[PDB]
Amino acid sequence: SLQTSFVTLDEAIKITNRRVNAIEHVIIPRIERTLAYIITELDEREREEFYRLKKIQEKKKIIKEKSE
Amino acid sequence: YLSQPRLTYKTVSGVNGPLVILDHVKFPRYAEIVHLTLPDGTKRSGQVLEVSGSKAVVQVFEGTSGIDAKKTSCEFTGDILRTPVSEDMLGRVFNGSGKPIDRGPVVLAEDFLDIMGQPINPQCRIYPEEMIQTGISAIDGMNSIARGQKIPIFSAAGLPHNEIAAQICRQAGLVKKENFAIVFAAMGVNMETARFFKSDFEENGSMDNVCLFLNLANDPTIERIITPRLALTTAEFLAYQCEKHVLVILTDMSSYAEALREVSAAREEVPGRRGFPGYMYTDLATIYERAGRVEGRNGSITQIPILTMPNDDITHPIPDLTGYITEGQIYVDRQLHNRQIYPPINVLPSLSRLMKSAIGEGMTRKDHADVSNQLYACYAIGKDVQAMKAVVGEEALTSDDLLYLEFLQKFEKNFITQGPYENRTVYETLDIGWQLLRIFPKEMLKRIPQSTLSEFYPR
Amino acid sequence: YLSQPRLTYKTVSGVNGPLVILDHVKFPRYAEIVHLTLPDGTKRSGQVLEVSGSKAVVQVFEGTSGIDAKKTSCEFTGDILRTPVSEDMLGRVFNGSGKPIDRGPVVLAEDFLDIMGQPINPQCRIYPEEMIQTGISAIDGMNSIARGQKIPIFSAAGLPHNEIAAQICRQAGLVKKENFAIVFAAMGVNMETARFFKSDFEENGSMDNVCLFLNLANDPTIERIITPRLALTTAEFLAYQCEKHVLVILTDMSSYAEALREVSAAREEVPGRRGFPGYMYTDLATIYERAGRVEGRNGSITQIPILTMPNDDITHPIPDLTGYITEGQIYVDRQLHNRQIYPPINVLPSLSRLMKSAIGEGMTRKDHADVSNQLYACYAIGKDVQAMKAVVGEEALTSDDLLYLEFLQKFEKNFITQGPYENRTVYETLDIGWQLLRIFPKEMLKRIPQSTLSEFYPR
Amino acid sequence: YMRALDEYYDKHFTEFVPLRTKAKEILQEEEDLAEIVQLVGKASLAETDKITLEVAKLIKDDFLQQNGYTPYDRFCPFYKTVGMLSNMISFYDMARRAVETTAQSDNKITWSIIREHMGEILYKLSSMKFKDPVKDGEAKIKADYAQLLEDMQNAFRSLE
Amino acid sequence: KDRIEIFPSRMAQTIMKARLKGAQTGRNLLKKKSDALTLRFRQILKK
């Protein structure tokens, strides 16, 4: 009984360590990279919106100068 | 030549960021140079970024602090920014604007060259084919440099890129088995880096042949925009008129691109990625593409830009656009520097577009292409095997994966690892490459044909 | 009628991308039409985007290249864009602006209609309940169309949305237990797509029922603003006055939205998400919402737009606002297409908001709704289990999860996958759905009441 | 354009369309496995899936990639391309048949057994790319690929 | 491959943070399961 438990636990340990390593070396780093990319691209959207609004504000100022 | 006395305007009409918008300027010229006597007698300089009607948006190089509207006097030089150039520039130190800081006299011009230079008519541009033996194995064996190639050293803050650049300068030579002149422009470099490079060039006898432009970390930011252009203009005077073989180094093109971003933001030009101007590709190309060799002229301008990849992120706009413009990149790696491999050239993302023609039969040796390609493949597979054993541990690897890991270890230990003063010939580098390719049975060298293998593999 | 002479101004005051700003115009009328004689006799058309005092901001459909101040003569037609319509528009091919390109004569107006279309009273709009047997099982069984529904085909660059739309066009007909006229507004479709659609409509002998409005890729890019309005105006004439049942296809609402963006940027309006004008929701609603039945009238307009989702992002403004306005989207999926599953309809992100009231006893069959819900649920669970299988491998999965995976496989193989020339009646689609549900035991079909389980499950 | 060109493929290279479809299926199957193997390791692989992985690696390394600056592969006529693909897909079919016929037996053929027995044939399939279109005529290259096909058809018979 | 291939958005950022924490919870639970199996295995070897 001891030997059978030992062998089966050996298999279980190998599989579980392979799962844990798979997660922490593939799945989690993949998600972390995707999160970094998402944050950067959202910063880009915000920057573009900022530029467009800045441009609109400048054009409104120029309109004030054109009217006055 | 200008015989007409030049107009001095006090008619400033605003000051915003680095921009002095003059008004009542008479026939203002685009990209003209303006000299500003500030109220207190400080003389600054600047360039007319825009002309409209009578206005003139003079971008001041040294910044605008202290500019009084009614008391600043801007005299219009009447010409574009022309740098005096003479061969006596070799063996000097200049600040970012070309003013001497070695306590030597101002350059006695042999000519005045438009700092922006001109494009070389591609039809009369020779294709770089002579190989520069940089001595670094990771370069000569897998990224070999040609003479005239624009090849930056991508790096990150704190890495040995200073040491690598000094090593390339102190053992560059042709594979024919005459000295290089060097023009070294530095931007945003700290005093430690300036001392390192100056001390290195002086410790070697090369200082007679080097011409430094320095814009240290606390010198004006907008002046970094023109420092590369001064350096390349001197390089062009030496290479295409004096026929020297000039190697140009441009330190911290990141500290340049950020000057570009500063000016472009003050101008509110359309931004690209991460805020950098929309035309940074064009500007970086105006710098880099001043390289290569010219029909009928014996000189050449190698370029080795150095740049700090922000956050080590090779998708960052500076390294990305520099990658699209330049002829390769030598990539310097933290994951090796932290292991204290020197030089930490991580070949796998490195590239040299003129290796394919700079190597082969009658130039270096005839196995060179196959050896380089096979080392690339074996290194890549070894890295993949490491990433696999990170999941499945030693037990699950087959003998072939163990072979690739053995190759990877002996490759980073023998091929990349190199003495900071060690000067390996291309033949020695190729032989060390073979010692590693022999780690494998022939059939695992899938990238090498039989004619090559049967001749070189055995010995 | 308008008896007064038209005023013609040589007074152009500006040219700016697609726009032409006039001045000194007498009492401008917003949305007025203008005929611009360019210097060389070329005659273009345009619409007054805005008026202000004496100014008008024309929007030239055929573009502004070649226009100049001081010689371009803008004739102000004095009325909004009234297009001709006639029943014999069926069997014609018109360019983007409704001019003929089939070498037949211009449309001898049976009546003149405002391309905007007079809005219909929600109190006397009928509810569409007659299901269209599109033949495509991925639609009839799970996202069925009803005669009057606005049901766009979301898709992406490279997917077979053209093939799907052509199949629907050539197979659609009422459920058995009224032959569609087609009005097809091609916008920004390349020549290959336009010729595919045209050759298919001729091949199926349908040309006597098809009215094509082509605005090819190379045609001017402001004309595709009014091309869909022309198409829907002719559709309304055929449906609500001639009493015909009309199926409107709009080939690329994304090309339309990008024409809108072009105009919005040219006007420098405050831009919404991703640069598109803020009023895109309203402007797309005026296009889509011209479908549906109406009391008294016997005709109807079915509407099947087609959307290219940029980067396949269904949250991009075009698909997002089209999903707000239209009664549910059929969804063509790259992950299926790359596996070579035609039609690549992904049934999870697609719905038909009028399906629920267009199926059931006497209309299609008693089990239709239950089969649809259960297939949807089983498919969703199968996709979740498929995601899990990658993580835990097929050993850790329970036999029930394996049942679900087999159902997913055979569901894509039998139910979705379909011959391009095969029209599965709704009854056949339901039988094929049951063939899959009977993979599961009755206990696991929780979304089917016991009555419709017992009646149909064992057969 | 693939559907437009078959009208011409079926009358100049009649086998190429099925060869192409099988090549794409093989690369898609190897892609699908890659996610599983990366997380789980090769112990779980079926014996036909090992053949799929190894044939896909053969195709990627030695049919797809093409060193464009070498006298043998700067140019690669379509007779050479379709020949290489035909040999590789024929190898794939023979190996899968060898596995599916002996999976139920005591003479079980495995990828390891095939690898050991045909280390030469696999290297020939790997070095097909080095045949030079001009230095070696079309007839010579087609003959050599036919001879490699014969060699494989003999090796598999002798294996089984 | 490097990225999960979800399209940038605040919705995507939320989903990715949820998924990262899900994978970290999986890591912790499986590591504890491995520790239980390892303690039992060591005990069983000693006995």
Swiss-Prot record, chains B, C:
Binding of ATP, residues: 353
Q: What is its main location?
A: membrane
Kindly state one GO CC term assigned in the UniProt record. microvillus
| Swiss-Prot/TrEMBL GO biological process terms | ATP metabolic process; regulation of cellular pH; synaptic vesicle lumen acidification; vacuolar acidification
* A molecular function (GO) term: ATP binding
Keyword Cytoplasm in annotation: yes
Task: Fetch the InterPro entries from UniProt.
Answer: ATP-synt_VA_C, ATPase_a/bsu_AS, ATPase_F1/V1/A1_a/bsu_N, ATPase_F1/V1/A1_a/bsu_nucl-bd, ATPase_V1-cplx_bsu, P-loop_NTPase, V-ATPase_su_B/beta
Q: Give the way it sits in the membrane.
A: Peripheral membrane protein
Q: What is this protein called?
A: V-type proton ATPase subunit B, brain isoform
Origin species, per record, is Rattus norvegicus
The major lineage groups are:
Eukaryota, Metazoa, Chordata, Craniata, Vertebrata
